[PDB]
Amino acid sequence: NNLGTELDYDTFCFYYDWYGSEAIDGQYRHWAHAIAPDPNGGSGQNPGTIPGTQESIASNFYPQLGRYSSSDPNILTKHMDMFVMARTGVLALTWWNEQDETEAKRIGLILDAADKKKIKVCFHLEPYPSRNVQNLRENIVKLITRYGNHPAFYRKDGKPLFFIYDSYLIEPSEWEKLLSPGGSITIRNTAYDALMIGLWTSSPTVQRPFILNAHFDGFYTYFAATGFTYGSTPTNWVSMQKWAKENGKIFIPSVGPGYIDTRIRPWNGSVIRTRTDGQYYDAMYRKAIEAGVSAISITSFNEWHEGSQIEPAVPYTSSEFTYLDYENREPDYYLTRTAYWVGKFRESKQ
Numbered sequence: 557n558n559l560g561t562e563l564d565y566d567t568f569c570f571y572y573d574w575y576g577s578e579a580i581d582g583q584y585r586h587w588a589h590a591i592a593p594d595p596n597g598g599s600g601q602n603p604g605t606i607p608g609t610q611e612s613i614a615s616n617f618y619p620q621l622g623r624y625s626s627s628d629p630n631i632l633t634k635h636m637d638m639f640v641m642a643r644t645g646v647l648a649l650t651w652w653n654e655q656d657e658t659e660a661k662r663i664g665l666i667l668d669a670a671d672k673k674k675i676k677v678c679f680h681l682e683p684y685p686s687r688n689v690q691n692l693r694e695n696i697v698k699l700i701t702r703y704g705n706h707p708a709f710y711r712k713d714g715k716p717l718f719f720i721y722d723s724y725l726i727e728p729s730e731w732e733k734l735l736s737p738g739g740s741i742t743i744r745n746t747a748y749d750a751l752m753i754g755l756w757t758s759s760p761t762v763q764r765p766f767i768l769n770a771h772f773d774g775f776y777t778y779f780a781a782t783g784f785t786y787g788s789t790p791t792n793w794v795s796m797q798k799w800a801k802e803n804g805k806i807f808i809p810s811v812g813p814g815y816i817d818t819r820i821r822p823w824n825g826s827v828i829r830t831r832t833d834g835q836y837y838d839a840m841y842r843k844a845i846e847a848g849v850s851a852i853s854i855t856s857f858n859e860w861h862e863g864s865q866i867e868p869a870v871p872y873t874s875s876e877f878t879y880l881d882y883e884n885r886e887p888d889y890y891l892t893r894t895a896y897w898v899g900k901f902r903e904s905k906q
């Protein structure tokens with residue numbers, strides 16, 4: 557078929573599975589969230605917590621699906637239909653190494669739901685406690701062993717793909733052990749080989765040797781807020797892509813519809829990026845496509861705390877907070893606008 561509605565398997569949408577309900581999970585997990593103290597704001601801050609009541613959730617926006625559980629198979633079905641509407645073929649699942657049965661259950665449910673709609677799942681390896689290249693290898697082995705034969709497990713040209721958040725927290729000399737073909741604990745040429753996509757943060761003078769010396773296969777930028785880092789400044793993307801191509805690396809720039817996290821980080825207002833009825837998203841997605849990249853990542857499906865979600869949101873005013881909303885756009889606008897941009901991206905790919 558050539559309908560302009562098919563999923564794109566070089567489009568990765570960052571997905572968070574940490575939401576809970578009292579009924580399914582025992583508490584409205586993540587809808588309730590601690591408020592972060594101001595890192596520049598001095599001692600004796602008791603910033604408190606957002607309680608995750610219907611009236612007061614840990615987001616500046618409000619989900620169409622309400623305070624949902626990420627473990628609810630019926631929510632997962634709806635999310636997969638939203639991925640189909642957006643044409644985003646890969647769900648890039650946050651992974652925190654919780655080592656508990658509720659995590660294991662959720663991951664299986666997500667894979668099962670994804671497969672019904674031909675969506676694929678890859679893992680976004682988060683900065684879990686004591687993360688290092690040895691336990692990363694062990695965890696890559698675990699994830700490929702447990703999930704690699706699931707029909708929804710993503711592969712690109714025969715290889716799994718992982719995104720590694722805050723990969724700069726690990727020295728290149730450690731990464732080399734895992735990612736160089738000669739490394740002491742290499743995954744190269746093993747059953748557990750994968751495309752490893754590290755997080756490009758700061759200037760080229762720092763990031764170019766880091767990526768080369770660490771032996772990453774590519775890099776992504778994550779942040780939805782333009783200008784937050786060098787990497788998340790879209791006017792740098794043409795030159796980042798040029799360097800990537802010259803050095804045999806895969807650049808997967810991250811695009812998002814906006815940013816606002818001031819319910820949970822009230823001191824962080826300088827990072828706010830207004831959605832402007834979709835114009836912000838359009839500008840950022842256009843820059844990614846114009847850079848001539850092979851793959852694009854979307855921050856985010858449902859990072860509700862950071863206001864980067866494309867998941868449907870609805871107007872809501874409670875006694876406790878007046879939420880932002882999609883304004884002159886309908887709740888599914890960011891899904892259907894994603895589909896528009898996926899089409900433009902595909903038109904650009906050979």
Ligand SMILES: N[C@@H]1CN[C@H](CO)[C@@H](O)[C@@H]1O[C@H]1O[C@H](CO)[C@@H](O)[C@H](O)[C@@H]1O
Binds near residue numbers: 682721862
């Ligand atoms: N979701 C946050 C932004 N994205 C990165 C990569 O997925 C995450 O590590 C990051 O998580 C931190 O911030 C969340 C609140 O926005 C916390 O709930 C989470 O525990 C973590 O501190």
